[PDB]
């Protein structure tokens, strides 16, 4: 019964944002699963709406996040996000939000997949938004092959990230890779440093790691480099 004034308002005037907000506020007083079915019906009617998808996923996450970590209801919200990615296209907000929400679930496998699908979906400009979160995500795991491939991509946009990659290789004990990159950097004298380090100091740091570690460093003619 009580749906029918708002249903008539919405079906006669689908572009009336005020009529949508009126019914959403009405459903906020109602029990919230019917609001989710409203959003299901609303997105069937108006999938291109930025406002409908953003509010739905915000409401979905805020309800579910208090539940048990293993609860299937999180996968329902995920299925909404999958559908959200389909309609919304260029709008950055959902791409960021879903990856963050899967980190809250600890779903490492699916978080990477959503990053990898975001990179596949969108231009390099959108990638530049993705990579700060994704590299910060990749560092937090013992997944060095994935982080190596991710770090490499950023370097031709961000030279300062090569310092972060060398520091990542140092902390991952991948000193042989770190020696290869830093020797390339020391030859690439146009390099830019967040510490402002000189090319002599970078070469010094190169020799600091190398002279400590003849065993680990193996791809390089150490004698030639120091001569």
């Amino acid at each position: 019964e009580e749906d029918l004034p708002y249903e008539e308002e919405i079906m006669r005037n689908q572009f009336s944002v005020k009529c949508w907000l009126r019914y959403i506020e009405f459903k906020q007083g109602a029990p919230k699963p019917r609001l989710n079915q409203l959003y299901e019906r609303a997105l069937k009617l108006l999938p291109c709406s930025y406002k409908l998808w953003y509010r739905y996923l915000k409401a979905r996450r805020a309800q579910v996040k208090h539940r048990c970590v293993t609860d299937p209801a999180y996968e329902d919200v995920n299925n909404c996000h999958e559908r959200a990615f389909v309609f919304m296209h260029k709008m950055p907000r959902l791409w960021l939000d879903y990856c963050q929400f899967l980190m809250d679930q600890g779903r490492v496998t699916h978080t990477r997949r959503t990053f990898d699908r975001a990179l596949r979906a969108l231009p390099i400009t959108q990638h530049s938004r993705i990579w700060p979160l994704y590299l910060r995500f990749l560092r937090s795991h013992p997944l060095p092959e994935t982080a190596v491939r991710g770090y490499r991509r950023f370097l031709k946009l961000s030279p300062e990230s090569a310092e972060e990659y060398i520091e990542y290789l140092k902390s991952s004990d991948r000193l042989d890779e770190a020696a290869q990159r830093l020797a390339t950097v020391v030859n690439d004298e146009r390099f830019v440093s967040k510490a402002g380090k000189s090319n002599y100091q970078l070469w010094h740091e190169l020799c600091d790691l190398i002279s400590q570690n003849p065993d680990k460093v193996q791809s390089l003619n150490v004698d030639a480099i120091i001569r």
């Binding site: 002279s211 400590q212 003849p214 065993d215």
Partner: peptide
């Protein structure tokens, strides 16, 4: 000093080098 900085750094590093060197040899 620039010169003495390398003196203090390598003095500690040589002892580490001798320790790891005897292990490798």
């Amino acid at each position: 000093p620039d010169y003495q900085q390398q003196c203090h750094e390598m003095a500690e590093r040589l002892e580490d080098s001798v320790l790891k060197g005897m292990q490798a040899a």
